[PDB]
């Protein structure tokens, strides 16, 4: 099936990406604490609601929080700046705090309930996000042998990612903080983020050798982000 785009709100984000963030793929932010990584999250949940002549899907959301840092006024916000309904946007997000790893991993496992519902109706599931994808796994396994069971969990836990999004045609959007490298990594694109001068935020995609080599710049505003 083709793919979709969500346009980020930044026409120089989305030009990096080729249009927006894809359908089908699981695409990776990650960049050290403020860098911009949940305000762009929010963004998206919004942007996907927009009808496609707009860089939307007409699509419903669902979001895995494992930090407690989904603000749904943020969302109101977002909404209002861009012409929608606030309320109506926030009520096809679908929200679920992560206590642990564990559940976290249970909670894909649920998500696919509610997209099957929704898929055939006019606001199917188009975007899943987790923020943060590796939080817990890395407060969970830690010491000696910890990185082999580490990575062999999350591994897993990006497999059940990558099913839903190419069996139900969803982009998964998901976050990871990295403190300024060698660990391997599943997502389809990864996205490095950081602060730049001004206020600006500067994003480069990371081992990826087909696509743009540039950088785009943006900034966080009423509008969520934006040029
Ligand atoms: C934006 C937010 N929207 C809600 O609160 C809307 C209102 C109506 C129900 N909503 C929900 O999110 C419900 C709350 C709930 C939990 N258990 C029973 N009901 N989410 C779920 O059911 C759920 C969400 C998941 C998300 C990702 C992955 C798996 C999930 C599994 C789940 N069981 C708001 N602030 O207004």
């Given at each position: 099936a083709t793919?979709?785009?969500?346009?980020?709100?930044?026409?120089?984000?989305?030009?990096?990406?080729?249009?927006?963030?894809?359908?089908?793929?699981?695409?990776?932010?990650?960049?050290?604490?403020?860098?911009?990584?949940?305000?762009?999250?929010?963004?998206?949940?919004?942007?996907?609601?927009?009808?496609?002549?707009?860089?939307?899907?007409?699509?419903?959301?669902?979001?895995?929080?494992?930090?407690?840092?989904?603000?749904?006024?943020?969302?109101?916000?977002?909404?209002?700046?861009?012409?929608?309904?606030?309320?109506?946007?926030?009520?096809?997000?679908?929200?679920?705090?992560?206590?642990?790893?564990?559940?976290?991993?249970?909670?894909?496992?649920?998500?696919?309930?509610?997209?099957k519902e929704l898929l055939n109706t006019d606001r199917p599931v188009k975007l899943l996000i987790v923020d943060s994808l590796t939080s817990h796994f890395r407060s969970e396994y830690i010491g000696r042998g910890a990185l082999a069971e580490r990575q062999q969990k999350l591994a897993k836990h990006l497999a059940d990612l990558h099913r839903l999004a190419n069996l139900y045609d969803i982009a998964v959007f998901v976050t990871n903080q990295v403190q300024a490298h060698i660990l391997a990594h599943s997502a389809t694109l990864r996205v490095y983020l950081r602060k730049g001068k001004g206020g600006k935020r500067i994003a480069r995609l990371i081992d990826a050798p087909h696509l743009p080599e540039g950088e785009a710049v943006f900034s966080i505003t009423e509008k969520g982000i934006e040029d």
């Open positions: 793919i979709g785009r969500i346009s980020t709100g930044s026409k120089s984000l989305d030009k990096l990406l080729g249009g927006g963030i894809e359908t089908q793929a699981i695409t990776e932010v990650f960049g050290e604490f403020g860098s911009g990584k949940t305000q762009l999250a929010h963004t998206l949940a919004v942007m996907v609601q927009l009808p496609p002549e707009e860089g939307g899907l007409n699509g419903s959301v669902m979001w895995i929080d494992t930090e407690n840092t989904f603000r749904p006024e943020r969302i109101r916000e977002i909404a209002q700046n861009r012409g929608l309904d606030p309320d109506e946007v926030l009520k096809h997000i679908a929200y679920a705090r992560a206590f642990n790893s564990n559940h976290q991993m249970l909670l894909v496992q649920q998500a696919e309930d509610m997209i």
